[PDB]
Structures are given as structure tokens and as C-alpha cells.
Amino acid sequence: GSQGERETWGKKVDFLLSVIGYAVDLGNVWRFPYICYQNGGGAFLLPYTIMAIFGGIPLFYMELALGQYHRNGCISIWRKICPIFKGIGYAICIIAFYIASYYNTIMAWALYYLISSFTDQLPWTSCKNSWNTGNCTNYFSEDNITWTLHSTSPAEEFYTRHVLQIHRSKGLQDLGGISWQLALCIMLIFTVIYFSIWKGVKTSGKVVWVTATFPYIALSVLLVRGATLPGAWRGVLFYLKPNWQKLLETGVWIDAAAQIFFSLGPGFGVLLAFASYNKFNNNCYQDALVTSVVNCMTSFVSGFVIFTVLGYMAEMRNEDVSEVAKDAGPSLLFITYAEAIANMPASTFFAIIFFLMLITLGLDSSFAGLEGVITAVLDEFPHVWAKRRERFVLAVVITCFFGSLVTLTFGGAYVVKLLEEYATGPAVLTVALIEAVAVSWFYGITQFCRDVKEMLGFSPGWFWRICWVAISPLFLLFIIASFLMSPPQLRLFQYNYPYWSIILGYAIGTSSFICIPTYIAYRLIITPGTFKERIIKSITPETP
Amino acid sequence: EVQLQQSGPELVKPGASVKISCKASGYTFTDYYMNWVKQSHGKSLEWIGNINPNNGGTSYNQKFKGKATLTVDKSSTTAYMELRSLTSEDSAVYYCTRSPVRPYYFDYWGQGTTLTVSSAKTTPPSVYPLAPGCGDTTGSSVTLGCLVKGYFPESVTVTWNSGSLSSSVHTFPALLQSGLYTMSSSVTVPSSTWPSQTVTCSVAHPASSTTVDKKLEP
Amino acid sequence: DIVMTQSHKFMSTSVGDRVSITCKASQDVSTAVAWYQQKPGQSPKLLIYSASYRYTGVPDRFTGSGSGTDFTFTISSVQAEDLAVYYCQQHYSIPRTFGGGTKLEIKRADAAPTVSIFPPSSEQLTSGGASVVCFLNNFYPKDINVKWKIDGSERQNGVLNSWTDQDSKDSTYSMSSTLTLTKDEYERHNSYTCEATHKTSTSPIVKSFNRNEC
Ligand SMILES: *[C@@H]1O[C@H](CO)[C@@H](O)[C@H](O)[C@H]1NC(C)=O
């Protein structure tokens, strides 16, 4: 009695666009076109689709099927499957905290760009400002200009010295203090996600209507804008120019495998939370199929959106779009792409809809990222929670604000890259590998096929079976071993990270991981009997 | 103004290593990329690679990757290029040239460095004065000369009266035979200054570090 | 990569004539091209950049044009000191490459070669050798025949012809014909004769000297 069964989605289209909003993010815009044009050019589509079909789709569909069938959170679902792995739900909660620290500061930059785009004359055009050096050299100035190693563009000057104020920090050692403008920008983001979350999936699905759809409009506007630009074919040429010798590199498949995983983000429990609220009779197979294609096709058309403007930017300069595409990261969108759209007519229009799109791309993914953890703890601690959902939502939101206070500093941009590379990447793959192995092996793939047979009415095909049994865990095992074997040496804004940054990153990487093996130690020490008896009861799920 | 002063010529045996200094002056050294260009005899120019003076960031060429190593020093404002595994193809003239980051062009070049990779012993030249006979008809002008024979490598310099004056001098290129170069020089001067004044040719071989001066006599 | 191709390795022009050297790239460069002037014995000197623009210190007689793969370097007034080898180079893509180069040879009127024969010096006779030299100065064009006579007879053994480059003042070639012999063979002959056949006159220019105290 009382509450009993959980809630359900309002409409089939709401959660369909909600999972699409979580998948489509900033990475689908800048990241995919860079790794595509760098590795093999247009030939990168061949391994990218293979890593999607074999690796990416089965994990995405397995994670989604477990959500709609069990209707449990990222924690409670392990109580009814493999209780020793219940720490997986806790690790995701620690992972999403590390994710939400930097992720909303990036949108705070795009929000600071959005609010600074309301002036008739955009600040990064002219070099006359409070934050510019004597190295600042803009256009609409004297011709014949020759660039200098020490010289800096007004857009690079604007992003370096103002929104980041990264010149005021020497590195990871001293990043202090905090920039309060980004603290207010991220506070508004934490407020707009507060009112888009606190109620539940009902408000998130409705706010997703705006946050998921608008990027495609802004992408289409910048697509038609970028296409009409003179000399935009150079970027598209360098974008789609096939290099088949790059396919012989053993690394490009790893880049394709890692790209498709982190773009779809399976096994993170967010897709598990979104599916928990759907209908039992409802079909999740057609959903996961088309949803992943949208994420890939959006990144494909986003490739033209970026490189058409990058091609025109290389047209006013001298060619080799690779050189203007040299630095990959926020500088591509916030400096190169922003300086490129500043030279176009009605630049206020395209600049507003650009950074708004960036906020629009990060809002939906941030809704679900918290939604997965909120659903996890609410389902894990029922009736000790749910007294008010705005209470637990406010607690996790303001916690991400204090966690972002380290990211809101002057050297906060240094911490963004430290957490994005070292921290989240390896542990999410590990927790998804342990998840995929536990579902396909411990719980068994036969009983999993029987649950789908009771769900949709038919057993899944042998293609998905061999993928879940072998191909999908091997897909995650491939990216793991490659990351651990070659830990990246990272550099940002003419500043090389210290040698010990990987040590600090491994601390942030293992700090989320320490829970599950200590929980397995907590489960095995509490369970009486012998090792074979207690583990069998620990391997056997809840009997009722 | 802006001057790039390289090192002198080098004669090295194959399989060894060699280093070439470049001394820059006349501008702010940290404001420009530093490049190195290889020019083979009778061939075109070849870009080896660049270097950033600030951090020492080196962008090489795929052809020269591992063949050349570019270094820089901000204290003396000097750039270096090191080469290992020397062959006969590596014998050529090398230039260090200044370039900005954009547009990318070589505005100022070094004077060049002559590199000769061979195991042939360094041979001092033989300076034999070439003088007109005493039975020749003296006209409005007399042509003189000096002969250089049996020197290795091709690096040599022949000057006349400390460079003053040559407004007519015909220097004939060196010819390589049996591992030793041979060349000749000539000068056309009027009959009013000869043999009244002093005219002397100076032959200098930098690789053997020898200088032999021979005055012309009738 | 990018390949800069100059189809003409040599282009003949005259003083004051309008000469244009071409350049062919691999792909579309928009406008980025640098024309360099390397005089013989000197480092390459930059002239044109971005294919329409002139570097500082370059006279007005040097221009450039074109936007595309093909580019043109135009000199309205050619001078004698303008004799050099010109290269075209692209700056966009790494690596930067150069063209094969086009040597500009100046065409002028014919000039009579000045032939001077020299006896071997006593310093060379001390070392045990003797060399009779034949100098050919200030003649055009480069093509000329040189024939040697020890006594009355054509000597084709031990003759080396060394052609210099074109002159930067009167644009006249100069060559040296060297005859090297042993001291024992030098003192067994007296009157040496070197002759040169050129297109300026049908009769070859004959020079001779005697070995006995000139
Ligand atoms: C320009 O930058 C250089 C180094 O990048 C710096 O030394 C110089 O002071 C800067 N110019 C001004 C006017 O601050």
C-alpha cells in the first residue's frame, strides 16, 4: 500500500527525447569532428560504426533493458542481481560528483559568453579593453600584419584573461582564488537544473523538449550559415578527406572505441534510471536503436557545422584547416569558432544562439546525470527518503556547487582537464565493464534473454547474445588496457602539467573505485557460513 | 640590421656527427621561429624543420625526422642543428633562416655552411702563380691569374689585393679529380698599373687552415 | 604533402625584356606563395609573399600575381645584377616545400672571346710539373669550341674546360682551358698553341708562346 509502485513517464516521446538529450552534449559537437579529421579523415566512420555496432549498441541496449525490466536505481538493482556489486551504484554516485564539478563550469563559461553577447559590439572583436595586453592584434586594423610568437588574438585574449582569468594562476599549485562571475553563472545553472529536476521525471521530460530540440536548430542555422561562407570547403575537405593508411594505426580504433562509448555513456546508471520509469509493456528495443543513431548522426552533421566555419576561418587565413584546428578543446568553440562567427554579419545573432546552444547541449546531459544518482539513492533508501524530492535534489545540487568551487578558480580550467581525462574516464569504463560482465555472466545471459523474452515477447537474437557474452566486454576491456598502458601527457594554454598530475588523477580515479571492493569485503565478512556458501548466497540474487 | 651568422665549413667522415651554430642579431630573438633549410648541389631548397625559441618546441619534417635535431639557447641567442649518420647525400649547403608564425616566409637567411662528408684526407692546396710571358704584346689591359691545385674539400677562397680592386675578375669553378679539387682565377687590369705597383693573389683553404700568398711576376 | 613544380628549369630573357616565371603547386593554395631570389654564391633572398605582396627592400620592378595552384613572378625591367635563380614556395601546410627552381639566363649580343695563353711558372717547375693555361674571357653565348696544339698537333689528352656562370655586369660567359703535363714532357717542347672556335667569327682565335724565356 501507500506509495507502492513507482511512477511512469508521461508520454513515449518525452523519455525518447530525454534519453536523446542525455546522449547529445558538447562532445557531439566539437569532439567528434576533431578526432574524425585527425584520424583518417572521413575514413574514421568505418571503425566508429563498427565500435558502435559491436561495442556501443549492446551495452546501451543492455543498460536500457535492465532499467525498464527491473525498475530499480543504480544501487537497488544490484541488491536484486549481484549484492556484492551493490557498490557499483555507490561508485557511480562518486563518479557523477567528479563529473558535475567541472561540467557545469563549462556551461558557466558559455553562460558568461551568452550574457556578454547582449552588447551591440562584441567584446572579443576589438583589442581595446581592460583585459588585453599589448600583444593583442585584431582585424579591421592595419594590413600586412605579421603574427608574433608572443602575439595573441582578441578572442584568445578575451577567453584567457577574462572569463578564465587563467593568467592569475600559476598552475595546479596555485589556482586561487575563485572568480565570482562564474560562481554566479554556475549558480544560475544549478538553479535552472534545480527547477528542471526537483519534481522528477515529469519536469525533466518537459524541459528536455526545449533543451534537446534547440541544438539541432542552432546547428542547422550554423549549418546553412557555414555552408554559405566562402572557402568553407577546405574545412569539409580536411574533415572528410579519407586517409586509409591511418586505419592501419592500432590507436585509431581505440579512439573510435572510446569516442562511441563516452558519447553514448552506457553502464552509467543514468540510462538505467530513465528506463526505470517507463512502461513494462513498452518496447525499449526500437528506442535504443534509433536513439544511438541520432547521437551519431548529430555528431556527423555537427562535423559539417564546425568544419564549414572552420573552413571559412581557414579561408581568411591561409588554408591547412589542421593548423587552425590545432588546439582541440574549449578553445576550438570559445576562441576559434567564436572569432570566426565574430567576422560574419549579424554576429550578435549567431553568437547568442551558439553559446546558448552550448548551454542547451549541457543542460539536458546535466539533468540526467543527476537524475541517475537521485533515482539511485531514492530507490536505495526508500521511505527514509522521498519525504520531499526537492530536499535530496537541493542537497546534491549545492554539493556540486562546493565541488565546483575548486573549478571556479582562476586555474579552474586546469582542473577541468585533470578531472576529464585522469578521473572519470577509466573508472566509468571499469564500472561499466564490471557491470556488463556481472549481467552477462553472473546473472547469466540466458536468464537475461528470458527477461527480454517476457518483456518484448521474443528472445533477443544471437547477435546481441554473442555481443553481451564476448564482444561488449572485450570492447570495454580494449579501451581500459589501452588507457592504462598509455596514460596521456596533458598540456593546456602553453603550460605543461606537472609529472605528479597523473598521481593526483589516479587518486581521483581510485577514490570512486575504493567503495566496491571494500563493499565486497563488507558483504563477504558479514555473510556467515563458508566462502563457497556465503559467496553462492552472494552470487544468488534475492530469492523472492 | 638583422644578421644570421652561421658556423664555418666542416669536413667530417661518414658515420660521425656534426653540429652547426647560428648566431642571430638585429631583432628580438624570442619573437620568431628559427628554421633550417638544406640545399643540395644543383638541387632545390629543402626545409628541415623549425624550432620555437621560447620553449624549444621543435616541428620537424617527416623526411628529416630523426635525421636532424634542433636546439636553441636564449642566453646567447643562438640556434643549433645536429646531424647523425652522415652519408654522401648529407654533403650540401645548409642555411638557418628566420621566419614568423604567419604568414610563413623566410625573410633573413644565414650565409650558409658548406658540409662535406668524406673519408678523404684533408689536402692543402698548391698555389702556382699564372703570369703572362715576356713575349706577349702589352695592350690596353693585361689578364693575370693564379692556379690552385690538389686540395680537398672544395672549400677555398682566392682574393686579390685585399679585395681592392676587383672590378674585373673571372674565377673559374673547382673541378674534382682523384679526390682533389683544382680551380683557377684570373683578373683583367690595365697596363698602366703593371708592373709598376704590387699585385698579389691570396689563396686560403679553410678546411686545412692554410693560406698561401703568391705575388705575380713577369 | 605538397609538391611545388616549376616546369621550366631554364628561361631565356634579355635585359629590359618582360619575363614571367610560372609555378605549379599540388593543390589549391588560395594566395600563399613566396618568391625567393638566390644569387650565385649568396643565400636565398625573399622577394614576394602572399603572391601579390612585396617584402621590404625589394625594388618596384619585381611583381607577382595569381590566385590558385598556378602563380606568376613578373619582372618588367631585367638588369645585369638581376641574374639569379628564382624559387617559388608555399606556406600553408606542413611540411613547407620548394620548387625545382628556374635559372634565368640573360640573352645579349655576341662577344668576341678574349684568349690568353700562359706559360708554367717556375714555382710549379720546382715541384716537377708544368701547366699551360688558356683563358677565354667575355664571350657570348656559352657554346664555344676549344682546341689545343702542343706543337702543330691537336692535344685532346689533359685538357679541362671550366665554364663559369653568366656575368652580373656585362652578362658574358668566361671559361678556362687547362693543359697539364709533366715537367719532362714540357721541356721537350717549345711553342704551345691554344685556339678557340666561336660563333662570333669563322676563324678560330689562335694564341701561341715559346718555352725558351718567353
Ligand atoms: C607580450 O607577450 C610577451 C610574452 O608572451 C610579454 O613578454 C610582453 O610583456 C607582452 N607585451 C605586453 C605589452 O605586455
The preferred substitution site among A127, A128, A129, A133 for testing ligand 1, maximizing ligand atoms within 8 Å of CB, is: A133
Residues facing residue B78 across a β-bridge: B23, B73
Nearest to B54 among A146, A147, A149 (CB): A149
Protein residue closest via CA to atom 7 of ligand 1 = A150
C contact set with A (CB within 8 A)? 28-32, 50, 53, 91-94
* Nearest chain A CA: its distance from C124 CA (Å): 59
User: How many C-beta atoms surround the C-beta of residue B75 within 10 A?
Assistant: 5
Question: Is A318 close to C92, i.e. CB distance below 8 A?
Answer: yes
Query: In whole angstroms, what is the distance from residue C174 CA to residue A478 CA?
Result: 72
> Do B127 and B108 share a structural domain?
no
Burial class (CB in 10 A: 0-12, 13-18, 19+), C18: exposed
DSSP state of A514: T
Q: Is A99 helix (H, G, I), strand (E, B) or coil?
A: helix
Residue ending a domain, choose from B61, B95, B119: B119
Q: Solving technique for this entry?
A: X-ray
Q: Which of A146, A153, A245, A320 would you mutate first to test chain B, the one with the most B CBs within 10 A?
A: A146
Residue B103 contacts A, CB cutoff 8 Å: yes
Q: Is C175 helix (H, G, I), strand (E, B) or coil?
A: strand
Residue ending a domain, choose from B119, B140, B160: B119
Q: Please work out, in degrees rounded to the nearest 5, the angle formed at the alpha carbon of residue A280 by the alpha carbons of A275 and A286.
A: 65
Query: In whole angstroms, what is the distance from residue B186 CA to residue B160 CA?
Result: 10
User: How many C-beta atoms surround the C-beta of residue A98 within 10 A?
Assistant: 21
Closest by Cα among A94, A112, A543 to A330: A112
Protein residue closest via CA to atom 2 of ligand 1 = A150
Q: Please work out, in degrees rounded to the nearest 5, the angle formed at the alpha carbon of residue C43 by the alpha carbons of C38 and C48.
A: 50
Query: In whole angstroms, what is the distance from residue C51 CA to residue C38 CA?
Result: 18
Query: In whole angstroms, what is the distance from residue B75 CA to residue A126 CA?
Result: 36
Q: Which residues of A touch B103 (CB under 8 A)?
A: 146, 318
Architecture of domain C1-108: Sandwich (2.60)
What's the domain range around B155? 120-215
Q: Which residues contact B115 (CB under 8 A, 6 or more apart)?
A: B9, B10, B12, B18, B20, B90, B91, B92, B93, B94
Chain B, residues 14-43, CB within 8 A of chain A, namely 30-33
Q: Which residues contact C167 (CB under 8 A, 6 or more apart)?
A: C80, C83, C138, C173, C174
Query: In whole angstroms, what is the distance from residue A433 CA to residue A440 CA?
Result: 11
Q: Which of C29, C30, C42, C43 would you mutate first to test chain B, the one with the most B CBs within 10 A?
A: C43
Q: Please work out, in degrees rounded to the nearest 5, the angle formed at the alpha carbon of residue A250 by the alpha carbons of A244 and A251.
A: 95
> Do B82 and B174 share a structural domain?
no
Residue type, position A420, single letter = E
For residue A487, give the C-alpha cell.
596514460
Closest ligand 1 atom to Cα of A149: 5
Query: Resolution in A for the shown PDB structure?
Result: 4.5
A151, A169, A475 from A417: Cα distances, Å: 25, 15, 25
Closest by Cα among A13, B118, A129, B218 to C209: B218
Protein residue closest via CA to atom 4 of ligand 1 = A150
> Do B115 and B51 share a structural domain?
yes
What CATH number corresponds to the domain at position B7? 2.60.40.10
Domains of chain B: total: 2
Torsion of CA A240, A241, A243, A244, to 10 degrees: 70
Query: In whole angstroms, what is the distance from residue B213 CA to residue B170 CA?
Result: 18
Query: In whole angstroms, what is the distance from residue B71 CA to residue B48 CA?
Result: 13
CATH of domain C109-211: 2.60.40.10
What number of C-beta contacts closer than 8 Å exist between B and C? 125
Give the H or E element holding residue A14: helix A12-23
One CATH from 1.10.3720.10, 1.20.1740.10, 3.30.1280.10, 1.20.120.400 for A12-513? 1.20.1740.10
Q: Please work out, in degrees rounded to the nearest 5, the angle formed at the alpha carbon of residue B63 by the alpha carbons of B61 and B65.
A: 60
Protein residue closest via CA to atom 9 of ligand 1 = A134
Residue A309, CB-side half-sphere exposure with 13 Å CA sphere: 31
For residue B66, give the C-alpha cell.
630523426
Residue A245 contacts B, CB cutoff 8 Å: no
CA nearest to C33 within chain A = A318
DSSP state of A84: G
DSSP state of B42: T
Residue A1, CB-side half-sphere exposure with 13 Å CA sphere: 0
Residues facing residue C5 across a β-bridge: C24
Domain range summary for chain C, segments of one domain joined by +? 1-108, 109-211
Nearest to B47 among C46, C95, C121 (CB): C95
Residue ending a domain, choose from B119, B145, B168: B119
Q: Is A516 helix (H, G, I), strand (E, B) or coil?
A: helix
* Nearest chain A CA: its distance from B58 CA (Å): 14
> Do B125 and B82 share a structural domain?
no
Residues facing residue A475 across a β-bridge: none
Query: In whole angstroms, what is the distance from residue A27 CA to residue A44 CA?
Result: 16
Beta strands in chain B (DSSP E): 3-6, 10-12, 18-25, 33-39, 45-51, 58-60, 68-73, 78-83, 93-99, 108-109, 113-117, 126-130, 141-151, 157-160, 169-177, 180-190, 200-205, 210-215
Give the H or E element holding residue C137: strand C129-139
Q: Tell me whether the omega of the peptide bond preceding residue A123 falls within 30 degrees of 0, making it cis.
A: no
DSSP state of A385: B
> Do B37 and B138 share a structural domain?
no
Q: Which residues contact B110 (CB under 8 A, 6 or more apart)?
A: B4, B5, B6, B22, B95, B96, B97, C43
Pocket of ligand 1 (CB under 6 A): A 133-135, 150
Query: In whole angstroms, what is the distance from residue A277 CA to residue A203 CA?
Result: 13
